[PDB]
Amino acid sequence: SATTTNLKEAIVNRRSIRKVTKNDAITKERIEEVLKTALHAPTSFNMQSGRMVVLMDGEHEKFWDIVKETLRARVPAENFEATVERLKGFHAGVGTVLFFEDQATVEKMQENAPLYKDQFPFWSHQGNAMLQHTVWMLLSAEGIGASLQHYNPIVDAEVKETWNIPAEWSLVGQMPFGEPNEQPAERTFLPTEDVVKFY
Amino acid sequence: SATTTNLKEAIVNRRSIRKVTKNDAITKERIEEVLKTALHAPTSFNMQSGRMVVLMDGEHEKFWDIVKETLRARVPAENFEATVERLKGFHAGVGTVLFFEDQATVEKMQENAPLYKDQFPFWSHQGNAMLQHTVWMLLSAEGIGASLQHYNPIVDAEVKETWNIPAEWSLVGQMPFGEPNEQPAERTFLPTEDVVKFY
Numbered sequence A, B: 001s002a003t004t005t006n007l008k009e010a011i012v013n014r015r016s017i018r019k020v021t022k023n024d025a026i027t028k029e030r031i032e033e034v035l036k037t038a039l040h041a042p043t044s045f046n047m048q049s050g051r052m053v054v055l056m057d058g059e060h061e062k063f064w065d066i067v068k069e070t071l072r073a074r075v076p077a078e079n080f081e082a083t084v085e086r087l088k089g090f091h092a093g094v095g096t097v098l099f100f101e102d103q104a105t106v107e108k109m110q111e112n113a114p115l116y117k118d119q120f121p122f123w124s125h126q127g128n129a130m131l132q133h134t135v136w137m138l139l140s141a142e143g144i145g146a147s148l149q150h151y152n153p154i155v156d157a158e159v160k161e162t163w164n165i166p167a168e169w170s171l172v173g174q175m176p177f178g179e180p181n182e183q184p185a186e187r188t189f190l191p192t193e194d195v196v197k198f199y
């Protein structure tokens, strides 16, 4: 359905859907296609330091349980339930995309192109963001709800250990997706003439 | 022409075109539309710290002359001509998009959401990257060649001063665009099974 929708609509219709349920139509195969297309997003010096680990169903829920538990040890009793309430809408989804950045790659590129050594650490985040956003738009184009979460770095250690992630991969973000199950919130924009100037 | 092309093609067909010429069909108005659509890209906490300053024709060339001159003072005589050779393909274009990030916004958001104070500086780069990439894809969808350059921070001061840019705006990148005038270079990809793991 990412062929149906044209570019402009894909940009404008992608919204953050924080509550998603399950659906058997959303398969590992379909996800596979989305990620293969998304990998066409560019990277500085084509270093392609981005890494994606997709957790589906069984493993998907396990992750969000990890988050819930990590929060249980860092939040006062009175705020716990309120803090983990939002985790429900993710845990209910089909799966979650874990976005990592290969730090060994960034470090090596800093050696090969010392003239940009200070920029590579940022281009690392830029490249991963472009990739994250592409995946997001593609999923929405296919009628799959998704949102971008950030439970790093508090869940990093645990996640890394339970899924044998190289030490050089740093967790950048998590994208829980699934059959949409909430109406996107209203979004406001600063007036255009304030963010854009022509000369 | 960004309605013609569908999403998947927009992702796959966007390439870096480093040599662009002029064309009167590429107007400030058309550019305007592209940027208004691109601003639908998301920002952390919807802080929208991104800022874009478009330099067209007269002012476009002036910028690239600034780059050329800045390089003339930082590069040994023997390497000058080789270093500024690539600047020709940009200077020949229609215009250039200057991507800034409002630092006062990032700093304020660090105050409002101290729980993510360490992430905002990176989300700043992420948000701007998502925006940069969207603009890039939209331009290509409309048959306009473009590339992403990084002459910051060496030209920052000069640019800031000759175009009255608030001090809190940091230069993140430059996108010279125009009538395509070069065939995109071959691009290679690391094997998919190495960047994507399923569980």
Ligand SMILES: Cc1cc2nc3c(=O)[nH]c(=O)nc-3n(C[C@H](O)[C@H](O)[C@H](O)COP(=O)(O)O)c2cc1C
Pocket: A042, A043, A044, A045, A046, A122, A123, A124, A126, A127, A130, B014, B015, B016, B017, B147, B148, B149, B150, B184, B185, B187
């Ligand atoms: C964060 C980031 C920084 C980049 N910086 C530069 C740059 O300074 N100069 C340049 O010519 N290209 C730069 N690029 C562009 C990449 O080299 C380019 O996107 C990639 O090789 C492009 O492949 P493309 O033609 O295949 O799609 C940058 C790309 C990213 C994602």
Ligand SMILES: Cc1cc2nc3c(=O)[nH]c(=O)nc-3n(C[C@H](O)[C@H](O)[C@H](O)COP(=O)(O)O)c2cc1C
Pocket: A014, A015, A016, A017, A147, A148, A149, A150, A184, A185, A187, B042, B043, B044, B045, B046, B122, B123, B124, B126, B127, B130
């Ligand atoms: C760099 C970056 C970090 C973000 N982090 C979070 C997060 O931790 N939690 C969350 O619910 N949304 C997060 N978001 C999502 C933004 O709040 C969201 O994209 C924006 O408000 C979405 O508008 P959308 O529904 O209109 O298109 C992040 C977005 C960006 C660009």
